[PDB]
Design a protein around this ligand. Structure first.
Ligand SMILES: CCCCCCCCCCCCCCCCCC(=O)OC[C@H](COP(=O)(O)OCCN)OC(=O)CCCCCCCCCCCCCCCCC
Ligand SMILES: CCCCCCCCCCCCCCCCCC(=O)OC[C@H](COP(=O)(O)OCCN)OC(=O)CCCCCCCCCCCCCCCCC
Ligand SMILES: CCCCCCCCCCCCCCCCCC(=O)OC[C@H](COP(=O)(O)OCCN)OC(=O)CCCCCCCCCCCCCCCCC
Ligand SMILES: CCCCCCCCCCCCCCCCCC(=O)OC[C@H](COP(=O)(O)OCCN)OC(=O)CCCCCCCCCCCCCCCCC
Ligand SMILES: CCCCCCCCCCCCCCCCCC(=O)OC[C@H](COP(=O)(O)OCCN)OC(=O)CCCCCCCCCCCCCCCCC
Ligand SMILES: CCCCCCCCCCCC(=O)OC[C@H](COP(=O)(O)OCC[N+](C)(C)C)OC(=O)CCCCCCCCCCC
Ligand SMILES: CCCCCCCCCCCC(=O)OC[C@H](COP(=O)(O)OCC[N+](C)(C)C)OC(=O)CCCCCCCCCCC
Ligand SMILES: CCCCCCCCCCCC(=O)OC[C@H](COP(=O)(O)OCC[N+](C)(C)C)OC(=O)CCCCCCCCCCC
Ligand SMILES: CCCCCCCCCCCC(=O)OC[C@H](COP(=O)(O)OCC[N+](C)(C)C)OC(=O)CCCCCCCCCCC
Ligand SMILES: CCCCCCCCCCCC(=O)OC[C@H](COP(=O)(O)OCC[N+](C)(C)C)OC(=O)CCCCCCCCCCC
Ligand SMILES: CCCCCCCCCCC[C@H](O)CC(=O)SCCNC(=O)CCNC(=O)[C@H](O)C(C)(C)COP(=O)(O)O
Lengths: 69, 642, 105, 77, 491
């Protein structure tokens, strides 16, 4: 097509239909990294999450008011 | 399974943003779509547990504010209302991402468009998952930052760079009031947590409750494009079609309604605000339906369609029927997202890439798949019985008469006009583009075809959800006695019984009877009797047409009389204060006075024995005069300076 | 300026007056068969004053002519997408070509 | 060095004027109307809200001591 | 031994930089190794010293207790008592960090006399740092006006076209006003016979004599931090002053006035502060509203940011004069947040654009994102930080200050929310214009951001975000100290 001066303009996203020669080489290199990150989110997520309606049973709360009454 | 549903789009957004140059273009679009897909699956898993098995999740990351009693944590709860907002947002956004892969195939900047597009999805997920009002504000602001980039995406187009600024600033006006409302929440209650604040609704004063929620309402007006702050909604078409396919369906537009729904425990005990909410919806529904009938742009009409359909969610809030509005929000995220994508395929299919509907005509045979998606969406938008629109839109209008109040009755006609107008401009859009004699050059038709499979897959998935989804999800939200305590409905405000029993038969069919009759009557006039619709004859009908076509002149009143006036106030301060009196009472003024006085003084220093002799003799009068007369000599001495 | 009948300068002005005379009527009437009638009607109106060599009546008719186009002007004119005022105007304009000039900053 | 900014002559007169507006400012009866509004009307305007309501707004946990909802419905008939 | 190490080291450093350069004057032509490569061996010494001063405070930081009430590290040097508390620790820490960035900002854009420039910057940094760690009104004043001598000469020698106009403005506005503070400091020394902080914190004066003292001190504060209608000096100074001067001026010097409210007004004139607080709000809120509307109708690039700093210093004053911990803590965090974002903007506007194209007229530039993408990225991010975006440190300061005002005065303090809307208008209109439409036809395509300019922005952005995401690094230190200033009796 045309000339868009991508010779010196080197943004983080490339710009103007930029695709590196070794794009296949880096493609899996990110899938490997990205998949590990999600596994981290699932390991972190399940370890720390909780149900706010089950931490305190009903009997314990039914006495808190009698203390503050 | 909670932390995966929230932060996965953020990881996908960053990968294309910074690693995008290293992973090409095509391999950078599908990774972003991959990150969203993970979140779509994780949401349904949560939806299975939350709605059905009544399990709630909460992941508290770390504290954020610890200033005396005010404690705010970076926490993200996922309760029933939160998941009922994740279904429209996360599902549609994946389809928008899937749609954008083949829509933006020719755009030179694809590694950047999907970086902001997913960042938008994450910014919305934080909004509908924060467990305190401040985390909601972190998401609330970042819809505007994400939209500002996306609406002004083509930063080389003047009408689009300015349109981003207009969308950013009007939202900040809403965000200016939201901050003020949040402050009164800390003042009155001491915290901005949902649990703490909502537990006090029945014990807090009405005036203090009214002040907070009026601020929320002004914040919501900007986002839901209601009356008085709706100029940005139509100006947002300057962005790419996927942006409009996402912002106006399950995103930035709807974010005003969610804020008011979340505040149901506070909103109930202030009848005055619920009246204001109801009246904004009726006017916005009435006005938008009228503007849409004389607009001549395919994306303006659909954009005005959302404002009318969002207003329907506002009137449902005003009758304390929060369940109805939430259910209609989910339905509208599918038969309005489908419209934009299909319309975005009509513009793509034609090789001239026109957007004015007056340059279309006779496309039904050439692109029958894109027509079928619009037609099914249009009937659903018209609330034809059997479709998703019927199970959500009609019942809201049913309950306008179902409250049996004066305000409720007035808005019923405004809804009923907009219920018919929805049936009138929908037919106009399809007829002008699919059942009309050709207008475009004949060379276009011999190249007018359909698009690839990637652009087609999302529209078919949304097409099915635009028929069956409303029926399957009705009893979850609109069921009788379904436990939905996340949205509070005060016992005195439960008018769902009277709505479904005391309405005469005529009302239950009236929107359809005028919708079907009005559409066909207009359809005949458009086809056989088009001489009437040349409005340049009747000056009254020309002035009327030119009035609604310019959108009630509100764009002209906002630009020429408020922004133009607002900028002039800044010019007055710059001229008469900053460079004005404060320069006369400053360096420029004091230079004149110093030059005046120092000019008088330099005359006195001159070698003369007689001159210095008189002043010495003159000073001897100080001793003679009674010292009560020093102030007069001081006054005289200043007089001689002149 | 001075409307000189039959001059080339007046030929262009009528050419401009007729160019806007059909475009404005094209925007209000979006069916071709009805649009063809309106063009003929206006063309049947640019023949009534075709043979007029009096400047005194030329200004008054030319004053009226602009008022008719200004009265019946369409608030939402149709524009080609890539032409200025359209929808694709200045969309992804190719970058300006100019050699980089390095500087020691 | 290489004069990378193509200096425009009329831009300079614009910036020169916009930085020297204070020289040409004259204290007529119109500049006196805008000085009064911005320095003696508005500051005194907020000078009354800031004092007519200072120490008169006890809002911290202001409880409710008044019913909200009507109890007996009287039809218009 | 903090102060003793700090002054002696710089005095030693000043003599070292004096000896090495001025030894070669003599009668001989300047064929010397030290001045080779633009005095590179004498700039590096100056940059090392500014880094070392950061290490001095850190040595005394690890001993600092965040729970003990009162002044810590109490030391007597030059017959002056020096102490550090919660508030003084963070402002000294912030001041010293801006030292190296001020020198590094002007590393290669001066025509000569780098040795003089380096010594001037260090003296400004040390004197500012010493100002937060004194313990009497007299010593507060000495370090509050000694900065005029290097600052007046720095602007005149290394200024723009109108440096003569600006050199007078900084010298006379900060002297004709701070003198009105000398009167009030002297009155304390007459009727109490000492200006020590702890001595005068416990003495109550008559209702009239507090007003006369408050006016004399508020005059010297309302000028140092630009507050309407005596704000008409900073925009001129910021336009003409060099990049190192502009970084320090709006980074630390203008925050001295916020700290001046803490030391000179709240504890010892506590009663009269409650009487003046409604007045401060009317003055401050109109400063916020006017200085944000005035910015809309500006033209000069560096003046535009100059008025932006005024608005975000009106929010600090609104928060600090609130009588609650919420207002006071947020006002201090905002000063810390504004201590990095504001210097960063001057690097983008007056340190990158000006250093290449040598002009400051907003009409030339537009669409710089076409051939300067990295510049735009930091332009947009520092624009959204400067407007009060939640993930930045400005929001935490701007939320708590706005919330702190509402608690003190719910009616007029509501107008403090205007900073949320107004800061978006003038700021993004600059960022929208600088990165919009086709690349300007008046600008040739030049080098993008270099490594030196990237470094400053990355090390001015990270502290802003860190405070924004997790401000408990700052709040925890201040919570004890900020709780002392509050004056209220509840029965
Ligand atoms: C360049 C950037 C520099 C950033 C510097 C700061 C990095 C974080 C500071 C150190 C944190 C070290 C750490 O992770 O400790 C483990 C911590 C365990 O703490 P614990 O209290 O037991 O967990 C329960 C909390 N509910 O575990 C945690 O608390 C982590 C909980 C965080 C969960 C939400 C994470 C937000 C998503 C971030 C996405 C971007 C980062 C990518 C991370 C890769 C994995 C996806
Ligand atoms: C731009 C350039 C890049 C540089 C900036 C990048 C962004 C900065 C990202 C990191 C921000 C710094 C904050 C991380 C430091 C950890 C803060 C911390 O101390 O957590 C306190 C937490 C509870 O406090 P406590 O019980 O007292 O125990 C600590 C005692 N030492 O104790 C703990 O249990 C530790 C918990 C650690 C949690 C992991 C950190 C999560 C950070 C990411 C999520 C941020 C919050 C979510 C915002 C996302 C948007 C909604
Ligand atoms: C801001 C806080 C409120 C300030 C209100 C200022 C109102 C005002 O001063 O209006 C003056 C302005 C027109 O004044 P002016 O430009 O002098 O008219 C010359 C005509 N030849 O009129 C305006 O600019 C319109 C301002 C409307 C304010 C509402
Ligand atoms: C070689 C001899 C080294 C000096 C040894 C000496 O004479 O000690 C005197 C003094 C030590 O201090 P000392 O008396 O023990 O008690 C603390 C009071 N400063 O040490 C001193 O008095 C040295 C003081 C001179 C160093 C400061 C010089 C002027 C600093 C101007 C700062 C401007 C801002 C304030
Ligand atoms: C860019 C956005 C910036 C932010 C937007 C602008 C913010 C200012 C505009 C809104 C001001 C906040 C709202 C404050 C007024 C309402 C507060 C309130 O509810 O209390 C009113 C107070 C009396 O309290 P109340 O409980 O209502 O009555 C009990 C009587 N026994 O006293 C009262 O009855 C009346 C209080 C004074 C009314 C003035 C309110 C308008 C302020 C306009 C400022 C000047 C223009
Ligand atoms: C919840 C908070 C999440 C924040 C993280 C978001 C990740 C996305 C970052 C991608 C950056 C990017 O893409 O910027 C770099 C790209 C590069 O140019 P291009 O558009 O690829 O075209 C290239 C062709 N040129 C050279 C003609 C442009 O853009 C730009 O220079 C456009 C300027 C505006 C950038 C605004 C960045 C705002 C970042 C977020 C602000 C808070
Ligand atoms: C209930 C009634 C609903 C409105 C039905 C009107 C039909 C319509 O809106 O269309 C009918 C006509 C014209 O047809 P068009 O498609 O609008 O324009 C066709 C495109 N031309 C003109 C370029 C060819 O417009 C109108 O006169 C709109 C009047 C709207 C306001 C009605 C009163 C306001 C209160
Ligand atoms: C009570 C509140 C105190 C606030 C601070 C004091 C006011 C500010 C004055 C700054 C003036 C300045 O800086 O002087 C600068 C000015 C002029 O500037 P120039 O360089 O000649 O530019 C202008 C160039 N023309 C004019 C050729 C175009 O010189 C003078 O007029 C010198 C005399 C200054 C008098 C100072 C008196 C101070 C009194 C303070 C107590 C009322
Ligand atoms: C950037 C620009 C800076 C501007 C600074 C503004 C400061 C605020 C001014 C408040 C004025 C005020 O409160 O005025 C009102 C006062 C009080 O008297 P009153 O009105 O009779 O009280 C009424 C009492 N009732 C209603 C109970 C009967 O009157 C004065 O004696 C004004 C003197 C101040 C100006 C000299
Ligand atoms: C923190 C406590 C500090 C106390 C000690 C201060 C030492 C001052 C320097 C003395 C040596 C000197 O005057 O030397 C002059 C030096 C160095 O000049 P150069 O550019 O290297 O000369 C090169 C000449 N060529 C190019 C021909 C080779 O420049 C200075 O004047 C900078 C520092 C002082 C400026 C302001 C002084 C006013 C102070 C007012 C009260 C604070
Ligand atoms: C929908 C809106 C409805 C309303 C829409 C607007 C319609 C406007 C009204 C229609 C008629 C109106 O009189 C306009 C007029 O007079 S203009 C013709 C002017 N005529 C002359 O002044 C004499 C000179 N005439 C020539 O020189 C040649 O005739 C020619 C022009 C062909 C040269 O061409 P060539 O050299 O042969």
């Amino acid at each position: 097509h045309h000339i868009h001066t991508p010779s010196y303009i080197k943004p983080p996203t490339g710009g103007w239909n930029f695709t590196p020669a070794n794009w296949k080489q880096n493609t899996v290199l990110v899938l490997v990294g990205f998949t590990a990150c999600c596994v981290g989110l699932y390991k972190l997520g399940e370890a720390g999450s909780y149900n706010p309606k089950l931490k305190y049973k009903e009997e314990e709360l039914s006495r808190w008011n009698q203390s503050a009454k | 399974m909670i932390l995966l549903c929230i932060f996965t789009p953020f990881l996908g957004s960053l990968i294309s943003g910074f690693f995008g140059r290293y992973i090409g273009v095509n391999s950078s679009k599908w990774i972003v779509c991959l990150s969203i897909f993970v979140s779509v699956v994780s949401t349904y898993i949560l939806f299975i547990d939350v709605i059905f098995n009544e399990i709630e999740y909460t992941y508290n990351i770390m504290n954020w504010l610890n200033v005396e009693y005010l404690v705010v944590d970076w926490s993200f709860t996922i309760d029933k209302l939160s998941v009922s907002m994740l279904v429209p947002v996360v599902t549609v956004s994946f389809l928008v991402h899937l749609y954008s892969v083949s829509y933006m195939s020719h755009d030179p900047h694809q590694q950047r468009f999907f970086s902001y597009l997913s960042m938008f999805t994450f910014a919305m997920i934080v909004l509908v998952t924060g467990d305190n009002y401040l985390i909601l504000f972190v998401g609330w602001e970042f819809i505007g930052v994400a939209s500002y980039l996306l609406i002004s995406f083509w930063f080389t187009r003047f009408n689009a760079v300015k349109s981003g600024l207009s969308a950013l600033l009007i939202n900040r006006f809403g965000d200016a009031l939201l901050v003020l409302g949040l402050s009164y929440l800390v003042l009155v209650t001491g915290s901005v947590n949902y649990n703490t604040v909502f537990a006090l609704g029945s014990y807090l004063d009405v005036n203090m409750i009214t002040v907070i929620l009026i601020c929320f309402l002004v914040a919501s007006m900007a986002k839901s494009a209601q009356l008085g702050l709706h100029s940005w909604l139509l100006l947002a078409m300057e962005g790419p079609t996927p942006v409009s396919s996402l912002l106006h369906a399950a995103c930035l537009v709807i974010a005003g309604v969610f804020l008011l729904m979340r505040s149901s425990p506070l909103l109930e005990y202030t009848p005055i605000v619920l009246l204001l909410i109801l009246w904004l919806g009726g006017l916005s529904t009435l006005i938008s339906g009228l503007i849409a009938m004389v607009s001549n742009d395919i994306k303006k009409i659909i954009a005005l369609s959302t404002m009318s359909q969002v207003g329907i969610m506002m009137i449902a809030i005003g009758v304390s029927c929060y369940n109805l509005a939430l259910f209609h929000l989910i339905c509208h995220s599918f038969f309005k997202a489908l419209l934009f994508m299909s319309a975005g395929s009509v513009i793509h299919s034609i090789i001239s890439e026109y957007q004015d509907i007056r340059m279309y005509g006779g496309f039904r045979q050439f692109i029958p798949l894109a027509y079928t998606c619009i037609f099914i969406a249009s009937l659903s938008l018209m609330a034809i019985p059997g479709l998703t629109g019927f199970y959500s839109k009609d019942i809201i209008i049913e309950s306008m008469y179902g409250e049996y109040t004066f305000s409720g009755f007035i808005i019923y006609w405004f809804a009923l006009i907009s219920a018919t107008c929805t049936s009138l401009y929908s037919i106009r859009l399809i007829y002008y583009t699919f059942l009309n004699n050709p207008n475009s050059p004949k060379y276009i038709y011999i190249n007018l075809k359909e698009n690839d499979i990637v652009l087609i897959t999302p529209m078919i998935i949304l097409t099915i959800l635009s028929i069956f989804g409303g029926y399957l999800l009705r009893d979850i939200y609109l069921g009788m006695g379904s436990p939905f305590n996340e949205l509070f409905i005060h016992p005195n405000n439960l008018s769902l019984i009277e709505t479904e029993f005391s309405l005469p038969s005529i009302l239950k069919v009236l929107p359809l009877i005028t919708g079907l009759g009005g559409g066909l009557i207009l359809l005949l006039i458009y086809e056989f009797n088009y001489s009437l619709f040349l409005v340049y004859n009747n000056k009254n009908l020309s002035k009327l047409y030119s009035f609604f076509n310019q959108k009630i002149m509100f764009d002209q009143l906002l630009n020429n009389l408020i922004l133009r006036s607002g900028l002039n106030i800044g010019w007055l301060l710059n001229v008469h204060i900053d460079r004005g009196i404060l320069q006369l009472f400053g360096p420029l003024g004091l230079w004149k006075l110093s030059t005046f006085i120092s000019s008088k003084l330099n005359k006195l220093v001159f070698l003369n024995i007689g001159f210095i002799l008189e002043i010495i003799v003159l000073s001897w009068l100080l001793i003679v005069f009674k010292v009560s007369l020093l102030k007069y000599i001081l006054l005289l001495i200043i007089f001689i300076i002149l | 300026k001075a409307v000189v009948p039959f001059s080339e300068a007046n030929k262009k002005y009528v050419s401009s007056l007729y160019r806007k005379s059909l475009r404005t009527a094209h925007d209000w009437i979006n069916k071709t068969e009805f649009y063809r009638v309106k063009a003929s009607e206006i063309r049947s109106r640019f023949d009534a004053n075709k043979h007029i060599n009096d400047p005194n009546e030329l200004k008054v008719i030319f004053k009226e002519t602009e008022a008719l186009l200004e009265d019946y002007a369409h608030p939402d004119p149709i524009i080609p997408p890539c032409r200025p005022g359209g929808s694709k105007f200045e969309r992804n304009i190719p970058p300006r070509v100019e050699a980089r000039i390095p500087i020691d900053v | 060095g290489p004069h990378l900014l193509r200096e425009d002559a009329s831009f300079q007169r614009y910036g020169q004027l916009r930085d020297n507006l204070a020289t040409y400012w004259k204290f007529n009866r119109k500049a006196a109307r805008n000085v009064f509004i911005f320095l003696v009307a508005v500051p005194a305007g907020l000078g009354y809200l800031a004092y007519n309501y200072e120490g008169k707004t006890p809002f911290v946990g202001k409880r409710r001591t008044e019913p909200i909802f009507e109890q007996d419905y009287v039809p218009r008939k | 031994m903090l102060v003793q190490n700090l002054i002696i080291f710089n005095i030693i450093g000043i003599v070292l930089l004096v000896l090495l350069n001025n030894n070669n004057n003599g009668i001989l032509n300047k064929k010397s190794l030290l001045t080779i490569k633009n005095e590179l061996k004498l700039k590096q010494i100056g940059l090392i010293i500014s880094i070392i001063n950061i290490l001095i405070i850190i040595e005394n930081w690890i001993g600092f207790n965040s729970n003990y009430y009162g002044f810590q590290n109490i030391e007597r040097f030059l017959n002056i008592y020096w102490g550090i508390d919660g508030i003084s620790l963070l402002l000294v820490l912030l001041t010293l960090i801006l030292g190296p960035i001020a020198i590094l900002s002007n590393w290669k854009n001066l025509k000569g006399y780098y040795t003089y420039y380096v010594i001037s910057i260090n003296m400004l940094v040390i004197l500012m740092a010493l100002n937060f760690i004194c313990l009497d009104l007299v010593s507060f004043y000495i370090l509050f006006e000694s900065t005029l001598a290097p600052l007046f000469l720095l602007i005149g020698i290394y200024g723009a076209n109108n440096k003569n106009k600006a050199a007078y403005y900084v010298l006379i506005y900060t002297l004709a006003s701070s003198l009105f503070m000398l009167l009030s400091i002297v009155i304390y020394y007459i009727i109490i016979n000492s200006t020590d902080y702890i001595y005068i914190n416990n003495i109550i004066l008559s209702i009239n004599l507090q007003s006369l003292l408050f006016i004399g001190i508020i005059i010297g504060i309302a000028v140092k931090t630009p507050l309407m209608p005596v704000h008409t000096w900073l925009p001129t100074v910021h336009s003409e002053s060099p990049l190192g001067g502009s970084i320090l001026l709006a980074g630390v010097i203008l925050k001295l006035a916020i700290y001046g409210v803490i030391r000179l007004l709240l504890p010892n004139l506590s009663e009269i502060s409650m009487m003046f607080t409604p007045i401060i709000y009317i003055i401050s809120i109109l400063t916020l509203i006017y200085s944000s509307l005035i910015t809309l109708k500006q033209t000069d690039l560096k003046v535009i940011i100059a008025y932006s700093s005024i608005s975000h210093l009106a929010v600090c004053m609104i928060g600090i004069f609130a009588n609650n911990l919420i207002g006071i803590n947020g006002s201090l965090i905002l000063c810390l947040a504004h201590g990095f974002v504001s210097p960063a903007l001057f690097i983008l506007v007056g340190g990158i654009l000006y250093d290449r194209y040598h002009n400051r007229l907003i009409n030339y530039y537009q669409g710089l994102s076409t051939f300067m993408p990295i510049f735009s990225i930091y332009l947009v991010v520092f624009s959204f930080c400067n407007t009060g975006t939640p993930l930045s440190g400005n929001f935490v300061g701007e939320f708590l200050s706005i919330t702190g005002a509402v608690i003190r005065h719910p009616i007029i303090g509501s107008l403090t929310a205007a900073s949320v809307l107004l800061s978006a208008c003038y700021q993004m209109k600059l960022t929208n214009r600088l990165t919009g439409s086709v690349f300007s036809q008046y600008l040739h395509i030049t080098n993008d951001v270099t490594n030196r300019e990237i470094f400053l922005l990355n090390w001015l952005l990270i502290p802003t975000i860190i405070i924004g995401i997790y401000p408990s690094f700052v709040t925890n230190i201040l919570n004890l100290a900020s709780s002392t200033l509050i004056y209220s009796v509840l029965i």
